[PDB]
Amino acid sequence: EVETFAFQAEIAQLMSLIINTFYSNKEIFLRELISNSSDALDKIRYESLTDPSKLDSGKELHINLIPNKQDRTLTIVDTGIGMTKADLINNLGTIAKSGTKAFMEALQAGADISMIGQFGVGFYSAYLVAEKVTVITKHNDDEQYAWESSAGGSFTVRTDTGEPMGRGTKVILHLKEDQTEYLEERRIKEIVKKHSQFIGYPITLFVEK
Ligand SMILES: CC(C)c1cc(-c2n[nH]c(=O)n2-c2ccc3c(ccn3C)c2)c(O)cc1O
């Protein structure tokens, strides 16, 4: 059972601009996703302070990076708070808590898209490098769900029949054919060192066999 949704107009416009831009500094997508993971880890850590049982679904707070040359995918996995079905639809489908309109105004005025995270929409920088993004998520209070979009104005959500996660979020970037450099461990390592060295949660790069 698959449900289809439309992006809010402003989000569709943002995705269109990102998807199509010749913006060369594409490596920033990774720090944005890592930053989101860190934020979600902050969220579960915070809740756990007053309700320890929230970590029954897993005590480890970490971020894993998983390149897959065979599938041409780069996966970012965290054990953060995850998202309920409602959270998932709202966070990805709407302006939600972000400064999306101010960002679009700033872009029109010639701002650098590296500022995207400052406007609370860093996730969409994934489309600099990905033709399709899948987001699998598990929150303590809901089932495991899979969100996906290849842009073009719509996304889908379905209950995930994949491998169960205890709790957290997995972002699967289905890379553009010209963007396979982000499957190279040496490339990933350097991007993490440049832009994510002061994230306090452990970030582990899984080197391909
Ligand atoms: C949005 C992307 C897909 C994403 C989300 C979560 C997630 N799991 N539980 C959460 O609350 N978040 C989260 C974190 C940050 C966010 C939002 C919304 C706006 N910002 C800035 C949501 C994640 O762990 C990794 C990710 O890449």
Side-chain angles (χ1 to χ4, degrees), residues 2-58 61-69 71-107 109-184 186-192 194-196 198-209:
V2 184
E3 291 180 300
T4 304
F5 304 85
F7 291 106
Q8 187 173 355
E10 292 84 352
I11 300 292
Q13 290 166 342
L14 175 56
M15 290 175 76
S16 182
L17 188 42
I18 296 168
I19 257 283
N20 291 302
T21 184
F22 285 118
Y23 185 78
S24 65
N25 177 216
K26 295 186 167 65
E27 68 178 25
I28 64 85
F29 79 89
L30 186 56
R31 73 159 187 209
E32 297 304 334
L33 294 178
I34 291 178
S35 180
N36 286 356
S37 290
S38 184
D39 288 355
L41 289 160
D42 293 340
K43 289 179 183 181
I44 188 72
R45 159 141 254 266
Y46 178 77
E47 295 199 358
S48 81
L49 296 175
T50 54
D51 186 357
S53 80
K54 298 200 169 167
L55 300 176
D56 289 354
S57 51
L61 304 179
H62 62 236
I63 303 169
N64 296 152
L65 313 174
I66 309 171
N68 189 322
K69 287 183 195 188
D71 291 359
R72 207 209 292 160
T73 58
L74 176 62
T75 299
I76 299 86
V77 181
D78 68 65
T79 55
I81 202 158
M83 293 169 282
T84 66
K85 193 191 179 185
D87 289 335
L88 182 59
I89 296 162
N90 193 245
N91 288 344
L92 302 186
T94 77
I95 297 314
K97 313 181 177 48
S98 74
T100 290
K101 22 203 75 146
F103 186 50
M104 295 302 283
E105 286 172 352
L107 257 24
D112 163 23
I113 81 108
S114 173
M115 300 178 70
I116 187 162
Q118 305 175 207
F119 294 85
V121 283
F123 167 72
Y124 301 99
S125 74
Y127 290 94
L128 291 171
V129 300
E131 62 183 11
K132 180 175 171 194
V133 181
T134 302
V135 174
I136 314 285
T137 195
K138 178 65 175 72
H139 185 282
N140 282 335
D141 299 338
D142 209 347
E143 284 196 305
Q144 189 164 302
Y145 292 96
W147 174 103
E148 66 78 26
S149 186
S150 297
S154 68
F155 62 93
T156 66
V157 176
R158 67 199 77 196
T159 305
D160 187 36
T161 52
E163 177 186 342
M165 312 162 63
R167 180 202 64 248
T169 298
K170 147 170 66 177
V171 176
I172 309 161
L173 307 177
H174 307 262
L175 298 180
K176 291 171 189 183
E177 56 178 6
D178 288 353
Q179 300 296 329
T180 65
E181 74 193 75
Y182 304 106
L183 304 174
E184 297 301 323
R186 73 190 184 288
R187 183 75 168 106
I188 300 163
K189 281 199 45 140
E190 186 54 47
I191 294 165
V192 168
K194 279 172 87 174
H195 305 301
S196 300
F198 295 96
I199 295 289
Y201 303 102
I203 303 165
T204 303
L205 171 57
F206 285 78
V207 178
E208 283 205 277
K209 303 178 294 305

